[PDB]
Every structure is written in C-alpha cells, then in structure tokens.
Ligand binder design. Structure first.
Ligand SMILES: CCNc1nc(-c2ccc(NC(=O)NCc3ccc(N)nc3)c(F)c2)ccc1C(=O)NCCN1CCCCC1
Ligand SMILES: CCNc1nc(-c2ccc(NC(=O)NCc3ccc(N)nc3)c(F)c2)ccc1C(=O)NCCN1CCCCC1
Lengths: 463, 463
C-alpha cells in the first residue's frame, strides 16, 4: 500500500492552488441535514493506512513515475513528501479529533476534524480526505442496521412482551453480494455493532485485529443448507436430502432451504408429514429453521406460517399472538431490506403471528445497496490560516442550500436539555456549553485514543 | 489472507450434506434473464486469491480455532483440507473454464464453470463460490459503463458527425464514494475497459499488476480544483482563486469548480467578463473546463451553456449544432448516473447544443450504486457424479420461474446467425455448434491462460 497513490488524482495538484503563505488547512466530516447516525469505522482506517512510517524514498519515486504518465506532466509535490520523510521519519504531521466510536449522533453535527501540525504540510490535510471519507461506508451500514433493529424491537415487544432473541433477528448473508473482500470485512463488522449473527467470516478477523472483544468471537452462525446441497440429491429425492441433513445436525440448530422446487409442498407434505417425526423430537436448543428463498417476501412468509400452523401444535402467548413449537422456526432471507422488513413484521402482526417465530437474513440490502448520499456524508474545509491570520471558510451553492458547509473552528457539545449542538467560529472557546466532546485520536503518526468493540456496542445500544 | 476463512460460514458445513459417494460437483455462473454483459474481473481473483500454495498447517489450525467458537461446535473439515496440503502441496485441485475477458455476452449464458479434479475434493467446488461470485462487481461496473458509452456515442455522432473524444466523455470521480480501497481499485479498472479518464488512482496499479498495458498507464487526468482550493481564498476573493489557478496551469487543460457561491454569477461575470482575457488566450490543447457541482443536473447544464454562449463566440457545426470556442468546455459531475446522463444529452440536443461541448463525471453512480441484482448474477450447481453416475442438477422455485437454473454439463457456442447459445446436458459433445468458447483459465493451482488489458479493451469495443 502506497499512501501517495491513495488519493483522488486532482489532489496531487492542490498544493499549487491554495493561497500563498497558508500555514493551516482545517477540515471536518459530517452527515448533512435516518435522523441519527452511529459513528464507527475511523479506528480501522487510522491503524491500517495512516499510522507509523507511511512514507519511504521508494514510495516517493514510484508515485512520481506514475503521476508523470497519468498527467503527462510533472506536477507531483516531490519536495513536500521528502520533507515529511526527512523531518518526521515518514510519519504524518496531522492531528485528528473525533467523537467516540459507537456514539449515536443527530444529523448535521461535526463527527471528526482534520488539520496539519506543521505549517509546511498545509496541503496534507485534504490529501487524506479520500481515505477518511470512506468512513461513510461503515457509518452507513451500522446506522441502517441499527434502524432495522429499532423496527424489530418494536414489533417483537408488541407481539411477545420482551426482547428475547432480538440481537439474533437480523443475519448477515452479504459476503458474496459485496464489491470486494475488504468491503466484506468492513461491512460485516459494522453490522456486528448491532447484532450477533453473521455468515460473512471476514468480519471476525477485522474486529479482533483492530478493535477487540472480551469474547473469543463477536459473531455466530449455525449449520445450514444451500441449493446445491439439496438439488445434488436429484429432483425426486428432496426428502432424502432433508432427512440426511437434519440427522447430521440433530443436536444443534440447522437452517434448511426449502424452496428448491415447491416451498409450500415442502412445508406441508415433507416437513409437515413425511419427516414430521424427526422434527417434533428436536431439542429447544436445536430447532429446525425452515428457509424460504423466493416469491413475494410477505406473501411467502404468511402462507408458510399458515401451513405450519396446521401441521404443528401452535400456542397463544400472553399477548394473544400465535407461537410455533420451540423446535420450529423460520428465516426469510430473500428480498430483505429496511423497507420490506417493515412490511413483513406489520403483515405478521395483522395476522396475529408473533415476531418470535421468525428471523431475517439480508445480503445486498444490508451491505451493498447503500451510498454516500444516503446520509449525505461530506468532508469540507472550514478554516485556514493565511499570513498568520485565520479565516472561516465555507461553500454555499445558490441552487442547493443543503450543500452549505459549516464555518471556522468546530466543537461538539451537550445542550442544557442533554442534546447535541455543533459550535462554529471557535465559539466553543467560550465555556458556555461545557467541554468539547471530540477527542484527539491521531497525532503525528500515532493513534492516541482507541475503543474496544465492546465499548462501541455499548455506545450503540437502543434506548 | 486465509482462504479457509474466506467463505460464507454455512459452506463450512456442506461437506456433510452432499449425497454420499459423490465424486464430482460441477457449477456455473451466469447473468440470468442491459441485454448484454461485459465479462471482466476473474483474472484478478485467480491471481490474488486462488493460485499457488493457499493452504498451510498454520492456516488449517487458525480456521479450526475460529470455527469452533463461531459455531460453538466442531464441524470444520480438517481432514479434507489436510488432504489438499499433503497431496497437492496446498494447491487447489480445481478446474475453471471461462469466456475470454472483455467478451460481450447476452444475458442467460454460461460465463464460467467450476469443478473439482480430484474425487476427494467434491466439496471444494462450492467452497469457493463466495470468492468467485464477487466477480459480479467488475462485470456490472464494466457493463454499466459500456451502456453509458452507447448513449454518448449515439448523441455525439448525431450532433457532431463523428466520435472524436468519446473515450474521454465519462470520467471516474468515485474514489471517495466507494466502500473500500480494494473496491476502488477493482471498480476503477472496470470503468477503464471502456474509457480513458479516471481520478481513482487505485485502478492504475491493479491493471499494471494483474493485466498489463503496452502504454505506461491506462488512465489519465488533468489538474483541477476542489471547493477547498477555491473557498480558502475567502468569499470575496473567488476571482483571485480562479485567476491564480488558471495561471498556474496555463499550458495544460484545467478543470475549475465554479459553484462555490453562485455558479451563474461565476460563468457570466467572473469567467465571462473579469477573467475573460485569460480564457480566450488559451491553447486548443489547454482549454478551461468549467465545472458546476450542484442544482438540477439538466437545468444547470442548459443554463450554463446559455450563459457562456452569450459571453463567448459560438460557431455552428456542419450538423447545425452549437459549439463553444476550443479553449472552453464544460464537465457536469454531480448527480450523474445512467438515467440522468440520458436526460442531459437529450435536453442538450433539443436546445441545439453539440455533445462536443461536454464531458461527464460520475462517482457513486459509476462505482457504488450497483448490486448483484442488477444483472441477476448467479452461481449454481448443474451437474454431479454420484456412485459413478452423472446426473443433471437444477433448481426451479414454484413462485419464480426466473430463478430456474440450467442443467448438466454446459458449453458456450456461436449460432449459425453469429449469436450466442449455451448448450445444456452435455449436448456440446455433439459437434453441431462448433467449438466451445469457454477456455480453461485455471487448473490445479495454476493460471493456465491470461489476457492483457489491451486485448480486453479490444474485445469490449462498441459495434
Ligand atoms: C428465529 C431463528 N432464531 C435464530 N436463528 C439463527 C440463525 C438462523 C439461520 C442461520 N443461517 C442460515 O439461515 N443460513 C443460510 C444462509 C447462509 C449464508 C448465506 N449467504 N445465505 C444463506 C443462522 F446462522 C442463524 C440464529 C439464532 C437464532 C435465535 O433466535 N437465537 C436465540 C435462541 N436461543 C435462546 C432460545 C433457545 C435457542 C438459543
Ligand atoms: C469536454 C472535456 N474534454 C475532456 N475533459 C477531460 C477532463 C475533464 C475534467 C477532469 N477532471 C475534473 O473535472 N476534476 C474534478 C474532480 C476530480 C476528482 C473528483 N473526485 N471530483 C472532481 C479530467 F480529469 C479530465 C479530459 C479529456 C477531455 C477531452 O475531451 N480530451 C480529448 C480531446 N482533446 C485531445 C487533446 C487536445 C485537446 C482536445
């Protein structure tokens, strides 16, 4: 990895565009204007890409050679990068302040700030904007995942009277559905801030190395079938496949995809009749989890439950909602996103089915179908010092008032009512709103403050 | 990187689910049912993750330790992995056949197949589905980018009479809008299959290391401003910032963001009057490229062109369309996706503006706002050998006919009319449709056939 080649191309030419005699460039990151966001992911970036000796004589030469052809011109700041190598032994003379990870903050507030600690490196601040802005991703995955948990908690509480098993109702099925291996790990780790279920193995290793947990692992899975393990037996032998699988995993929970040919026939005749004896004998610690995987998500779930309710003994919990026996559950993992999840639990409640009967799996909807525009994640310069005089800078496009950026030195505070407020123009300097909530997390090539994955989860809890 | 920890969790348990006495598992990839797709990206995966010695005693132990806790049970196939380590020195006993990279194939055709070469490793075929399926991303980026080139080619030819500069009309602005550094490199390289302009530097190194070009680099850029380099001068000094920037880059093309405060005032008064003398003097090889970055994309472009056409000498080309002077152009790089791009060129044409005047920049829309569902990318088992007998495998969900998979051994052929057809059930064996277009690209831990980035671009050319 070469940090000199890890920025938007045009940033290579910025050192020749700022006003002469500029000694400081101060910038901040915010989610402009999903009313609250979970701040998570910065720590990973600081350790993997920004800390330690990130500049070498060879990295400078390589960058120079690429840029010469890329621009068909010599515009690369070789002297500037050589200064960092010689003066700081390749360590970045930058200071980053940020809100603690796992913190849930309302939109339009400063989440972190970046600035240079050496006047010679005034151009460095925005050089690293590209790398830091990518924090939008783990922030968005964690936020959207937490919003789904809110919906699940509401309906589970209404239909059951408690939140037992909540942290297991949204399972990560997105490994193959993301853009890369690195994204898989970052995204899966962000989802684990809210839940404990994942099949995206890559997330475990990331958490262990960059955050850490008291427990051996932060996420869990159970044995389960895929279409290949069912269909390989032959069209006419779906029953033999089911029987063999549940027998191989008879003492632990097992998820079995049942829509290979006819989900309704499988539920009613196969599980419901032919193999019913191997199901009602299962332990409460090892239920069979039926998994449909096609058709209209809501219609399929409701019909599946109606069928099962007629083949198995259902009870009525204390809230008046129907409950399948303890050795039988369902997981809907097709076409699930924040919107369809809401429709399903609502539809279930209307038909008097408890949310305890179901769990949801989500792939593309959880880890891939998200953009930097969802939460309006933005990085902008708000303050500079030129000729020894600091000025508050900002943008304010006429055609879009929402793109208006904040001015001057920023700080985050608690309001008298216990809410959040971002003070601009160095006003935090006045002690009218108490202490600044941001903490220095990076300074001159070193990580100065960190959080365990356990603290992050605590910070991200629901009210 | 540990391949044993690079799969969907449940696949760790599949070796106990296949029918007993199974010696072969054969699977394929396709974009079910954007009528044609560009096949690209597999080579990167084969070299980075699948080739050479991918198994060690340490990797086996590491995987075992993680899985024991992840599943809270011992279900890991230690024996299976140890067999590969001792017998093939950690090399994968697998064979992958694929259509040449860059090839343009219609939907619903086999793109690549996977199978085990050793009977003991029948479970390996689908273990690596997760890694291989991620090819959906570079395939999708390349396909979506090519479809945008088609729109541009159509309108440019209509308004200008030719396609000069077409390969520079869609620029990659997505570096910060993607989910990770790795994705950035993959996505940027996929766009470069169709165009020559990028600011996502990461793509260059990926191409050079895994594919290669005759030229030094495959992508180019020009110096340009960002809001920070304009706003840092102070609200009242936007003109000073502009003057300084175009003067620092007086002999090469230069892109200048002009919507900091008022894009329309900037075009008409600043560029149009105050600094008009530094513009009209510019060389045809170094034009000023004005860049709006806010407001309704179509309304903004049209209004900017109307303003410029009144402050600078416009000519009427041989097609009757309006053309700005050679030292002046425009780039719309906000809110650009496949849909808005089409609305812009159509709006420009109705107003009699030539497409020569403009280029487009795209970030999230080009590299992030895409899913595995866009082209219905799917990997499925179509053939197995059990008890020495081969059988055709497939799924056919009752609620979704579109989810039906192909059966048996597959092969891709040219039709008599020069189109494409995928033969099922080993019917390719009969020599009725000529030669199979799929080639062995990987076998037993070695890449057997590779393509240069130059061949790939050639294969992906527009008709
Ligand atoms: C409603 C089900 N409940 C739960 N389901 C799961 C659960 C269900 C399914 C899968 N996997 C799966 O479907 N794999 C397919 C797949 C995999 C990858 C991919 N890419 N695509 C598809 C899984 F990993 C976990 C876990 C916990 C609970 C839960 O409630 N635990 C708390 C219960 N607790 C206290 C009471 C006594 C028992 C212990
Ligand atoms: C209509 C414009 N035409 C062209 N524009 C560009 C072009 C325009 C703008 C930018 N960069 C930019 O806006 N950067 C901002 C930015 C950066 C990152 C980020 N994340 N966000 C925003 C760029 F890199 C390239 C290139 C070639 C042509 C073209 O036509 N060349 C071939 C014709 N040419 C041949 C040689 C003789 C003269 C005629």
């Amino acid at each position: 990895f070469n940090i000199l080649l890890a920025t938007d191309s045009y940033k290579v030419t910025h050192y020749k565009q700022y006003p002469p005699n500029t000694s400081k460039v101060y910038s901040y990151f915010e989610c402009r204007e999903y009313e609250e966001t979970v701040f998570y992911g910065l720590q990973y970036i600081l350790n993997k890409y920004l800390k330690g000796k990130v500049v070498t004589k060879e990295k400078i030469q390589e960058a120079k050679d690429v840029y010469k052809e890329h621009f068909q011109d010599d515009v690369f700041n070789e002297k500037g990068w050589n200064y960092i190598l010689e003066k700081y032994d390749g360590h970045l003379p930058i200071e980053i302040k940020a809100v603690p990870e796992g913190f849930v903050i309302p939109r339009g507030n400063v989440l972190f700030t970046v600035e240079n600690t050496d006047p010679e490196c005034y151009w460095l601040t925005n050089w690293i904007e590209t790398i830091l802005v990518q924090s939008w991703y783990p922030i968005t995955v964690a936020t959207n995942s937490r919003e789904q948990k809110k919906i699940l908690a509401k309906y589970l509480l209404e239909t059951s009277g408690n939140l037992d098993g909540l942290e297991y109702k949204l399972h990560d099925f997105g490994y193959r559905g993301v853009s890369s291996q690195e994204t898989a790990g970052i995204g899966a780790s962000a989802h684990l801030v809210n839940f404990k279920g994942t099949d995206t193995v890559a997330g475990l290793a990331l958490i262990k190395k960059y955050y850490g947990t008291k427990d051996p692992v932060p996420g869990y899975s159970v044995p389960a079938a895929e279409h290949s393990t069912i269909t390989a037996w032959g069209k006419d032998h779906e029953k033999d496949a089911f029987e063999h699988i549940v027998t191989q995993f008879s003492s632990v929970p097992v998820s079995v995809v049942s829509d290979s040919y006819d989900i309704y026939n499988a539920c009613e005749k196969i599980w419901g009749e032919d193999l019913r004896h191997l199901i009602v004998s299962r332990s409460t610690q090892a239920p069979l989890i039926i998994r449909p995987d096609s058709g209209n998500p809501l219609d399929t779930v409701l019909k599946v439950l109606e069928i099962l309710g007629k083949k198995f003994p259902v009870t009525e919990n204390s809230k008046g909602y129907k409950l399948l026996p303890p050795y039988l559950r369902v997981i809907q993992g097709d076409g699930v996103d924040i919107n369809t999840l809401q429709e399903i639990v609502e539809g279930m409640k209307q038909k008097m089915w408890s949310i305890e009967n179901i769990a949801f799996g989500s792939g593309g909807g959880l880890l891939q179908k998200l953009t930097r525009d969802l939460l309006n994640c933005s990085f902008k310069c708000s303050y500079v010092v030129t000729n020894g005089l600091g000025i508050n800078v900002f943008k304010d496009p006429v055609a879009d008032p929402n793109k208006r950026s904040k001015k001057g030195r920023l700080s985050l505070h608690r309001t008298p009512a216990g809410n959040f407020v971002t003070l601009e123009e160095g006003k935090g300097d006045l002690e009218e709103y108490g202490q600044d909530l941001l903490h220095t997390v990076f300074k001159n090539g070193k990580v100065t403050k960190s959080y365990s994955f356990d603290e992050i989860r605590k910070n991200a809890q629901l009210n």
